[PDB]
Design a protein around this nucleic acid. Sequence first.
DNA 1: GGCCTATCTCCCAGCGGTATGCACTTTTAACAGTCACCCCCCAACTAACA
DNA 2: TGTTAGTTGGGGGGTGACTGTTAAAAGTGCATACCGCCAAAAGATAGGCC
Lengths: 192, 324, 1062
Amino acid sequence: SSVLASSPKKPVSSYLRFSKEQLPIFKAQNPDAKTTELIRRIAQRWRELPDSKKKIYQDAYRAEWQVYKEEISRFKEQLTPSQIMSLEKEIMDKHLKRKAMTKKKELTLLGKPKRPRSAYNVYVAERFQEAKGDSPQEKLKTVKENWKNLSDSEKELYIQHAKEDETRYHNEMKSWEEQMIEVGRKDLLRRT
Amino acid sequence: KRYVTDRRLAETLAQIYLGKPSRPPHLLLECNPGPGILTQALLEAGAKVVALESDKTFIPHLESLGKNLDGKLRVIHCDFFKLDPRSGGVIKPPAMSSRGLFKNLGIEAVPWTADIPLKVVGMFPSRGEKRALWKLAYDLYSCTSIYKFGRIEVNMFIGEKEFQKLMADPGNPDLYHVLSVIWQLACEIKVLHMEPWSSFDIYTRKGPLENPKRRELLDQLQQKLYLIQMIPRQNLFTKNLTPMNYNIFFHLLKHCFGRRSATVIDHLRSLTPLDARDILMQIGKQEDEKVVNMHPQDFKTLFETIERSKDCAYKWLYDETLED
Amino acid sequence: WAKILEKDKRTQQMRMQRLKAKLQMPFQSGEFKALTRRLQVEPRLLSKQMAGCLEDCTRQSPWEEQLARLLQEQLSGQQQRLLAFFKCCLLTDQLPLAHHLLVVHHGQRQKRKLLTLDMYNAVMLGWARQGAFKELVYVLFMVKDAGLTPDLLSYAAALQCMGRQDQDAGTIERCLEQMSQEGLKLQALFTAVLLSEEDRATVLKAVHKVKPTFSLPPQLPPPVNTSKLLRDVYAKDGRVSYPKLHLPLKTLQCLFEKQLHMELASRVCVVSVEKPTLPSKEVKHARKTLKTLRDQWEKALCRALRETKNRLEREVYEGRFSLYPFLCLLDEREVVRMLLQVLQALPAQGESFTTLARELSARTFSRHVVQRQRVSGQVQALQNHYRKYLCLLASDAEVPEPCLPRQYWEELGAPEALREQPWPLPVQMELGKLLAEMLVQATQMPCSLDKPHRSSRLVPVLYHVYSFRNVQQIGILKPHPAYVQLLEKAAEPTLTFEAVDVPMLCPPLPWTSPHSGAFLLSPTKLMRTVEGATQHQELLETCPPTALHGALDALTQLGNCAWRVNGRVLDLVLQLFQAKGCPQLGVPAPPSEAAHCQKVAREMHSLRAEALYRLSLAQHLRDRVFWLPHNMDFRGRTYPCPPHFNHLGSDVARALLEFAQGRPLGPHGLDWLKIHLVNLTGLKKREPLRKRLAFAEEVMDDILDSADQPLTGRKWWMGAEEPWQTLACCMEVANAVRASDPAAYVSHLPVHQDGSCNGLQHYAALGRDSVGAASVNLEPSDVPQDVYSGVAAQVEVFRRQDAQRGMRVAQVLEGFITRKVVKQTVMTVVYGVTRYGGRLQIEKRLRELSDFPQEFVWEASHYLVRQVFKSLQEMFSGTRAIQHWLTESARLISHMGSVVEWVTPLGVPVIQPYRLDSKVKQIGGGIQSITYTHNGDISRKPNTRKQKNGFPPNFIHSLDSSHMMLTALHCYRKGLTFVSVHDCYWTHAADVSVMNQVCREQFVRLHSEPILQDLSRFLVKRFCSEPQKILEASQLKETLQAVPKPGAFDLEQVKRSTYFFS
DNA sequence: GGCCTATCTCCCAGCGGTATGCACTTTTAACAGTCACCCCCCAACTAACA
DNA sequence: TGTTAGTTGGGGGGTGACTGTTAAAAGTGCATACCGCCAAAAGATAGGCC
């Protein structure tokens, strides 16, 4: 079992407790409205709420904070050092993974062109739907066998398509590199 | 400094150090008798006393009060500290050399593998205990100075603050030091008796202390003194850890405790031009261990496993230039 | 594939739409900064009116007019680093990075407080050099928003900005009436502002448009001094015969070119002075092992350097300090060559981390200064000034009127060579630490040197080992033993010097200012001072320039002297040094010698390394003339800047150096050389000159066999106290005797004139002590008188008067007293000494004798030190009074936070670098954290033990320096070359009488002035008469006005004394 | 009274690791509906890195 | 010459970004004290700082 999943639940904030209370009511009243608009309206209503009632609602947050402190103290007393090390390793791996997807989304959002697909990839993209077998893996194996059975004369068109794709990739890469040099993204520039 | 004026501890300590009194070789060597009631207590119990009194006063009193009995004082003006002076020793009335104390008694020499030849009792100094332990340790590992002959028993009193760091184990993170490794490695230590400060009488160079305020001030700390018995292990000196190459091991212990919150891998990389992982899984341990989590015996294990790899000539990266 | 292309194209269109939305998004948002890198230019200001113009006068040439409209309206370590960052970003063209850091530090609240006015003015001038109006307006917006009032240089940058980019606008220097309203005059813009000359030219272009009738103030010739002691040298209506060098214009010009190439290369290589090694297979293996010698590590250093610069640049963009411009100052080639040359000559014992860092930082700074001077075009200006300067002091050239080199250098057009002050100590420490870390981590070698097939592992070249002594440890870089074996295995060319260490080949730069002098391009400070302390330079520049004039001229007189190497002398030294050296006579044997053995090997290797360096520099500089610069210390004493071949060295050094220009001997020629050789024998000290000359005539056969066949002869010259100088002098006199006419022989040999116990001589002059004026030779008498034998004979009276009773005194002291045991304490009474140290000295002296009871050393030392101090008190009376008064004054000034200060009669002021140990500062880092002490902190309190012990020896040395300077300046007029070791004066053998005459004359003229009285008046005007506290005015005013009263001694009689300085 | 030290300048050399506290900005998550993104399987090539 | 890797089209499913308002745990940088006594004779001499 996951060590992080066995941790006690975090204390619910008063604003989020109010939002969770009012979410089904607003969902039933406005089913066709988007959730973002409903959350914004709930937050606007919370802004209309005075802070005195926020303090009265946060008194229970203080009490449940004391309860959660006692629970996490008992859980930490029940944790072995091996479990603590495993939890720390899991937290570090989760943080590294989160930074990895953050960097991947940052690189994808900037508009980096994809790698130039070969003629085999072009044939797979063109003829995947017209392949025998219900399973996608069977379709992929059938298309790969068909590509192996193809002759060079039929492959010449796919080689030309791959050449045009490589030229388009080179043009987009040059434009992308010029735009990053305009903003000085020297780390994103290719060494070769 | 420290002297006893109570007959109860005198008799109890005489029975403790009595044990088996059948000692045809040299029997007792008291570090500093002082008033000498412990000397007459040991003569009463059937044990000889050889008073190595450091102070030039009270020398004739012991011999005048002890020559008439069959048990002889044989008082010699020396101390159990301040012996074998190097870069000096032409003139020395307080201090005195090593062979002079033994040609006056006739011990001569025995090999290390024999039984226990002598027995030395007394005090450590109030301050500078670490310097005394270092001098004793260098005399022990060098097979020179006092311990040139076979062995010794050096039962003394030591303070509690230095007793806590005198031996430690894997764990005890605040107090694991170099001397803790050295003193367990060299000798086996047993504790014998416990003493308070108030029983001992505070003494000065001119005479006994006459100030009640000073002795009450020193007694309000109440450090619990500890009777400790060093006995040298028979096979301490081996083919890998020789008495000519011990200073490299002292360097290893001083450097390896130099950065306390660290790993064995980094210190061994800085010390030897060898792959430290090979040595660490050769002795049986893993990579990510910390230096405050090893036995004292593990240090000798690591040090002796280094040397037998004779394929590589350059192995230690330590010379006399590092002494400075 | 088609629909995939369509959907990817649509997604790409949404991606550029999001990118354009991010461009519309302001740079203050964290997401737009994190996703896309950029440097921010538009400032953010936390005020309503400034934000109002932010929207208004950026939505809009009003920005041209705003540049003139805005004109109408104890430093911590981080502050020093930021100021150095901006000043370094001025010189390299990276102004956007400086603007980025400035606006980022203005954005956050805590970093705003670090910024001071000069930090704005630097980047203001930097943007003014390119002539952009709107960014000047932005920086002035920042200045006015921060509450800092603008300064004169800030307005200068604005006027320079309107001056360039000529638009012929009417409103150039618009609202200079506002400059008048704030109170700034336009004449202070041209002078006393640190901007360059081109800035003055452009601001002059800007200033003439409004007011055509505007001219510079007329210049005036430099004033001469009217001080009493310095009047005669700087005076009119005088007939002067000034000296001139022997070699012509062409030799000087060629040697100037050679020295410029030597200094621009910044490194010299020296041939090996030892024997060559026999070729073998292993010799060829180690010779061809150059594949790993630099090529496997130069690329690694380039990689590490580029990666470090990229990392430091991306840390620059993220609002933090960095060493990026400090590492982009110098090119990659020379900054790698620095590490490659530092890695050479590594001993087996290594060195500490801090020493290596301190070396690397200074080595970087020197190359930075010389390369910047190369780029800016001051080298050609220096050449075209030096060619016309060298018309003076040339044998083939003449002058309209004769004058000193400094006045002729000022009479020509001003060179205007201004150099920047060195970096503060934290930046030097960090840069040296970074370079040391890069060296220790980049260089790694395969450990399989003996057999490549044995293993494949990469080991470090330098290990971090701890060295423990007492309680403490220290970090040490230890080379691997295989590299040490490789270095000392096969071949040792292994010699490389800097450009500062080797002596010059051209006449030195005259000391025009405390900034300029000594070497032509490389920097050298006027006062030798520990690193970080800078109060000496502030005191030397705060004073009027005229007061230092003669002092600087004295230094120039000590720099124009010409020196050659005597090959005949060091032929024998090389013959002994290459073979098995004899440790007798100073030549070191090799440590091969065929606990204590290791100490002997360490000492012998330490001596032999300096022997290698000195003899290699001797063989390289053979048959070539070399000239030495000089500088002045903390007190005033002078030493040559090269530390290897200074003539203030041993005895084997002074056996080699010999003058270049020559003088003929004449009537009184060879008598002085004969007396000199008897003086250098040391056998016959206490006789008059006639007996020394008779003794010299007695031993002519000894002299000739000591000279004509020196090697394997009767070996007379070894018995002298100073053997090699005796051999050189005997060679010169043997050559001089065998002549047709001995009067016409050309002399190149200096003659020592020396004062025995010069400190007591100056004390007896100050106190007018009649009894002490005979013990040291300050009175006319026929025989010389020594103070050592006087003390050793006066203690005998006390010995007999005590041991007539017959205590343990008669066992030792009535048997064994002599002047050899009381020589050291009478040598060192002028310096600091006490009864403890003197007791140790005579204890060693007593235990040195083999025939002596060792049981009675201890009490005899006590008795002897007591009687020696009693005898010295009896002989010298005013000396102890002056020492006590000086110590009391230093103590009473050091109780308050006041370092003692005094002014020499020649005009030089002196401070003292004694303060308590500051809060030490540690640099956090990867491999190791190192600590240092910052000497520039004025906040730390004075050390009142190192000042009370140290004022009395320093005052006497100051007076010694003044007397030497006076006799140098007065020997220059009459045509005499003067070289001084401290209290050791050298001229040619012909002109010793004229030196002695003006030496006594200048001594009487110097000590005729009330030195103690003017010191008391100066220390009453300064450090007193203040309402700060009452105890100071009660104690210092009483103590400092009390001076020791003089005795009854006629000072003019020194003019007829034959043994003062003889 | 108790204690610490011892001779000025130049040359060379001139200590580190670790625990705790203070001031402050920066995430950050408190929780949840909804929508694409990515981890991985079905086998490969060339672009890139070393 | 040896080592990684991205999509190529489906398919199951946790998960970051989009919407959110407000207090609040934690990293950064800096300073400071304690230890780190790897040793080594005292025979006693002053005298001023603490």
